[model samples]
Target chain A: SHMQCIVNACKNSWDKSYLAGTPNKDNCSGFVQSVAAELGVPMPRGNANAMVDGLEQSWTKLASGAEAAQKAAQGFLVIAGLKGRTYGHVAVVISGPLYRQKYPMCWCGSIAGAVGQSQGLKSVGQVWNRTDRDRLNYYVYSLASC
Target chain B: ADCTFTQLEIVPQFGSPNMFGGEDEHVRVMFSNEDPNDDNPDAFPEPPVYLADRDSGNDCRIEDGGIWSRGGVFLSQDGRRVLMHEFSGSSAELVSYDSATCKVVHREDISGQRWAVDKDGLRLGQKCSGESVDSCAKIVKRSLAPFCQT
Candidate 1:
């Protein structure tokens, strides 16, 4: 039910006039934070790195990307890069394990490298691939189920 | 929030929205030259608020995370102010403008991206690049341009 709000918000935000709670530019963490706020989720007010800390307490952390994508059915958050980029990146999973239901499809609003534009819906693989590739660190968090 | 300008036309030089996040892009803002008596103070009185081009030194581009490369434009809820996120390599700045003046009234360094301003011109968000979340620093209000903080 909580994720439903997030999904609706994400869908409404796509190509809409960028407004409050919807970003006009970079700051991936802020975009996800706005989505979480809509669901009354307590999220930290910082970049992706800081957000990792905020979600650490209230959400469940998965060891691998595959597991994270699978459990993301209830809505989840993913933070990339902790050591490389000072700010890092964050995204929200709104759908199932994509590509034959194996990897989670996500909604990411980032301004990084060649993928600067806001991606309303994209697979996780399309987001983190460039240069060093998988060298970037990934942190996954999901809401604690009732 | 009432906007005197019903529509905004953004023309970007060098690239479109589909370009890579780090592409060299500069944008120009033009208001729809329609209503003469919308009485929206936030609407631009003239044409072409030419924003500075993204610095070649920085990696400003539109990415999946957001607009990371140089700078991008955002309209206020009341449409009185235009918020510009200008970037210079690793450093970034937030600039505010009034439609009447079409000039930079305020400027400040930013640690992160993706910021939003309320109808009251109050900014509620945080910047990145800090030792911790507490130190990341949120912007309470950068300026009252196009309006005042109540």
Candidate 2:
């Protein structure tokens, strides 16, 4: 299957709806939403605070693997207005066997145009963590998969 | 030959390796103007800057578009540039990805504080309305020392 096709079908149908083949934004929300659906997991709703709270709870209860981490804290949706400049993005924690770190990711507009771990993974992680003291323009969602 | 907008008919019930094929589930901001005709590079132009592309530098390309500010700004103190940016719109933030060092940085908690005016300078503007004088004064008072940082 073409990698792009997989992105389109998964991304196009969602509450947040930003699929591949779009000339616009490239970020992880669409990808995560799509993946959650594929896994048969319901998406959540609420503000960023609520979403964080939900993830913490879900995360604590899961088997402590990467997949559980993602499922428990999945569905962090960034609605319009809440999205910041380049801070608009999302990700999933694809778990492996024990002792492996979670794989975080996102997609967004690229004037240069490349994809995957090198391009997507690191940026999403940085955005979510807020490592830089200067950058602060994102609004997070609450967890309520609805 | 391949053509533009080549149409594809969907074959229903196609199985996806990632999907179990059950019913798929689903779920669920900038700035501003300058003048246009002004010829001065420092001055706003008459046409207005709908979008301005400040040179990110020779090593930088906007394509990998995550955090565009890395390796510091063009201007710097001690020859080390600081990553400073302002986003127009309801929201803004600074993101840094240093491919040279493999470092990534994001800050989500800051508000209205973009560049370093001084360590203790007024980083954000305060309203000067007479009725809200105290609110404005407080900003200045809190920022004066840092504003004069040497």
**Cα lDDT tens digits for candidate 1, B6-63:** 2122433344421111111232343322112222212221223333233222222221
- First chain TM-score in every candidate? 0.65, 0.34
lDDT of 2: 0.27
Which candidate ranks first by TM-score, i.e. highest? Answer: 1
Docking quality category of candidate 2 according to DockQ thresholds: incorrect
Best by DockQ: 1
Per-residue CA lDDT of model 1 for A1-146, tens digit only, reads 45555467555544332335334334466666665555556667766667666665555555555565555555544443332246456666544544223334566555432233234334444344322223433445445321
How well is each residue in A1-146 modelled by candidate 2, as lDDT tens digits? 22232233334433233344422222234444554565445545432234333444443333323433344233433221123333333333321221213322333322111221112222233333222212322223334232
Q: Write the per-residue lDDT of candidate 2 for residues B1-150, one digit (tens) a residue.
A: 111111111111234321111110110000111112212111110111111122322232223222222211221122112222322211233333232222233333222222223333223323322212243333432222211122
lDDT scores of the candidates, listed in order: 0.42, 0.27
Off by over 4 Å in 2: A1-10, A13-40, A57-90, A94-146, B1-68, B71-74, B77-81, B84-150
